[PDB]
A paper describes a structure:
CI orchestrates electron transfer from NADH to ubiquinone and concurrently translocates protons across the inner [name] membrane. Our cross-classification results indicate that the type-A SC is the most abundant form, determined at resolutions of 1.8–2.4 Å in most CI and CIII2 regions and at approximately 2.75 Å in CIV. The high-quality maps, as demonstrated by discernible ‘holes’ in the side chains of aromatic residues, the precise positions of pyrrole rings and the Fe atom in haem, and S/Fe atoms in SF4, enabled us to build accurate atomic models of this form.
Author numbering:
A (entry chain 1R): 12 to 16, 27, 32 to 40, 60 to 70
B (entry chain 1G): 117 to 118, 121, 126, 214 to 224, 241 to 246, 248, 704
C (entry chain 1q): 78 to 94, 108 to 110, 113 to 119, 122 to 131
D (entry chain 1C): 77, 79, 129 to 130, 133 to 134, 136 to 137, 150 to 157, 160 to 164, 166 to 177, ...
E (entry chain 1A): 38 to 41
F (entry chain 1Q): 64 to 83
G (entry chain 1B): 164 to 199, 201 to 226, 230 to 285
H (entry chain 1D): 56 to 64, 77 to 123, 125 to 126, 130, 134 to 135, 137 to 160, 164, 166 to 205, ...
Write the structure that this text describes.
């Protein structure tokens, strides 16, 4: 897994902020 | 704050230790 | 089954108005595990 | 509107004082495996939070 | 007897 | 406090663990 | 799939909504039924320690089990309480798990149809 | 089927007891609000209005309108289930329409967790004893709006502390089943010290059984 | 009334169904503040973090303790966690209802064409 | 601890 760690469910896309109030604290 | 790493947070810690272990 | 509707059409069908489907694959199925070392 | 109670019998199970400042999860579980009671063991323990500023 |  | 086999929780067997 | 209803708490009033005109489980053959002449038991609502013997007894006199709601599933809001069984799996073998608190009558209809597929 | 849920005939109640009142003592005032929808699960907004009124120790409220909608929802269930002990279907279609109103205002058809101490959670979308702005402009009790939480430092601090710790802190109402009251003892911390729930149905229960519209989620709490 | 399920009943952009972890327009949005866990009225969220930025290593939600109340979505200051529109994720075993960081991230990657328009519809009432 | 064979063990097992 991206962390590094009974199909084994594993996400494949290994990973203000844009959008104004839709992002993160500025 | 006190009131218009990244390992643990103060409220959850007993006490430190959390769950038996502590931009 | 209802899980066959893609998420884009899921909005329309329910009158609500990296991407990435797969239906409910239970009975792949998701098996849980610890994501930490 | 703390009948009304409060027993805290009107609310607890037969043969069981929970509302005394008594552990939240209690002392015994129940399972079939009838139905029998056993000492309480939680897969995840209640995480006590220290919120007081 | 509805349960017992 | 052991670790749950399935999810890695912090299991317990002491009822008075959070009694303060 | 004539279900016997173990209506415990709020999940029960979200499943009597599926027999309501909008969903009408009877159109699928699923009838609001009676004496456990029943095939599937829907454990909908918190199962208390006090009631668990009754649930097991009616299971024995009955088959499939559908668990509706977080309470019946794994305890939900009341999981850490001394009076509640953390899930109905500890008492009866469950075939289908309907998540939600309460799950929508549509979600329970999905659970029933997935039980039909099973 | 006419046991109104879980009743052993006394009445040997305790079949729906879940230690709600004890669990409220382990959870902050906001975390305990959802506990009040699951008491009379036919009068969710009316249940969580009394708790909000008590906490506001510490307003929107819309609360009275949704309390009347909830009164109609509860009385439909009471009368139709009494008759059934099926009009039940005829009026449960209307109950479904009301559940859609609930879901449009909160997001859940039954347990909205919408009437909060300080007013109501969100505005109506551009919306329809005793059987048918919107919140207090005090960011030390009610969380700030998400736009301000991401632009103002005081708002971010208050949003952080109101959701992790909470705010530092019976009252009876005419619920659709009678007098629903809460004896709240604060504590001075961010969590209730004691929360007794006077349910209308407890004294009433002390084939109705139908005319007392008994819901065991409140007789047992 | 009767509708022909599985035509489906009306819902709103505020619907509180299956949870999902979201991403920035690839990086995750969760910075592990643990405010969803702190608020979680059912203690359904187990998080562990480490430097690695500040992102979660463990991010679990127990759908069998969860009361599906959206408090986590509301506590999250970065729109990372959310209740999706999906109400049709019934399983045949209990273990499938104990979600993981991978399960929640896959939920956010599958339902993103809808949990991004619903937010845009409702983000101005929040 | 922490079809008839299902209520016998904890989650997983
Ligand atoms: S799962 Fe939720 S709706 Fe169902 S009985 Fe439990 S609290 Fe009530
Ligand atoms: S999901 Fe949101 S609230 Fe929860 S830890 Fe991540 S950033 Fe914090
Ligand atoms: S919806 Fe509520 S109960 Fe479920 S994980 Fe989020 S905060 Fe916890
Ligand atoms: Zn940025």
């Amino acid at each position: 897994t991206h962390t590094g760690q009974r199909q084994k469910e594993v996400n494949e896309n290994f990973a203000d902020g844009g959008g104004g109030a839709l992002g993160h604290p500025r | 704050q006190d009131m218009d790493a990244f390992t643990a947070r103060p409220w959850e810690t007993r006490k430190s230790t959390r769950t038996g272990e502590m931009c | 089954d209802g899980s066959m509707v893609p998420p884009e059409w899921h909005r329309w069908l329910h009158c609500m108005t990296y991407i990435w489907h797969k239906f409910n694959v239970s009975g792949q199925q998701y098996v849980p595990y610890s994501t930490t070392r | 509107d703390t009948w009304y109670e409060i027993d805290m019998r009107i609310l607890t199970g037969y043969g069981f004082h929970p509302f005394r400042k008594f552990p939240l999860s209690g002392y015994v579980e129940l399972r079939y495996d009838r139905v029998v009671a056993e000492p309480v063991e939680l897969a995840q323990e209640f995480r006590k939070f220290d919120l007081n500023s | 007897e509805c349960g017992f | 406090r052991w670790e749950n086999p399935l999810m890695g929780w912090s299991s317990t067997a002491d009822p008075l663990s959070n009694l303060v | 799939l004539w279900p016997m209803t173990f209506g415990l708490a709020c999940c029960a009033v979200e499943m009597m909504h599926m027999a309501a005109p909008r969903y009408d489980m009877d159109r699928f053959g699923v009838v609001f039924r009676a004496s456990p002449q029943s095939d599937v038991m829907i454990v909908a609502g918190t199962l208390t320690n006090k009631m668990a013997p009754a649930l097991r007894k009616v299971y024995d006199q009955m088959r499939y089990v559908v668990s509706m709601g977080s309470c019946a599933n794994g305890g939900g809001y009341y999981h850490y309480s001394y009076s509640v069984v953390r899930g109905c799996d500890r008492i009866v073998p469950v075939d289908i798990y309907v998540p939600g608190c309460p799950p929508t009558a549509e979600a329970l209809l999905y659970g029933i149809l997935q039980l039909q597929r099973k | 089927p006419a046991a109104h849920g879980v009743l052993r005939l006394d009445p040997h109640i305790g079949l729906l007891h879940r230690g709600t009142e004890k669990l409220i003592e382990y959870k902050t005032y906001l975390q305990a609000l959802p506990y009040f929808d699951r008491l009379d699960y036919v009068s969710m907004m009316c249940n969580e209005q009394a708790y909000s009124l008590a906490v506001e120790l510490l307003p929107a409220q819309i609360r009275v309108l949704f309390g009347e909608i909830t009164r109609l929802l509860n009385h439909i269930m009471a009368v139709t289930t009494h008759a059934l002990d099926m009009p039940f279907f005829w009026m449960f279609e209307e109950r479904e329409k009301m559940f859609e109103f609930y879901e449009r205002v909160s997001g859940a058809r039954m347990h909205a967790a919408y009437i909060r101490p300080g007013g109501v959670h969100q505005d109506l979308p551009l919306l329809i004893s005793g059987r048918m702005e919107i919140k207090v402009d005090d960011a030390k009790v009610s969380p700030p709006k998400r736009a301000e939480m991401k632009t103002s430092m005081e708002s971010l601090i208050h949003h952080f502390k109101l959701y992790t710790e909470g705010y530092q802190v019976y009252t009876a109402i005419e619920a659709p089943k009678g007098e629903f009251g809460v004896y709240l003892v604060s504590d001075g911390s961010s969590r209730p010290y004691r929360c007794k729930i006077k349910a209308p149905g407890f004294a009433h229960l002390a084939v109705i059984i139908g005319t007392q519209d008994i819901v065991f989620g409140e007789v047992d709490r | 009334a009767t509708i022909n399920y599985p035509e489906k009943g009306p819902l709103s952009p505020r619907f509180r169904g299956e949870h999902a972890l979201r991403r920035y327009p690839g990086e995750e949005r969760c910075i592990a503040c643990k405010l969803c866990e702190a608020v979680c009225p059912a203690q359904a969220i187990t998080i562990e973090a480490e430097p690695r930025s500040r992102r979660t290593t463990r991010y679990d939600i127990d759908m069998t303790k969860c009361i599906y109340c959206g408090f986590c979505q509301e506590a999250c200051p970065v729109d990372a966690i959310v209740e999706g529109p999906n109400f049709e994720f019934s399983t045949e075993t209990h273990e499938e209802l104990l979600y993981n960081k991978e399960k929640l991230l896959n939920n956010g990657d599958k339902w993103e064409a809808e949990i991004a328009a619903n937010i845009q519809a409702d983000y101005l009432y929040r | 601890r922490s079809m008839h064979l299902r209520p016998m063990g904890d989650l997983g097992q």
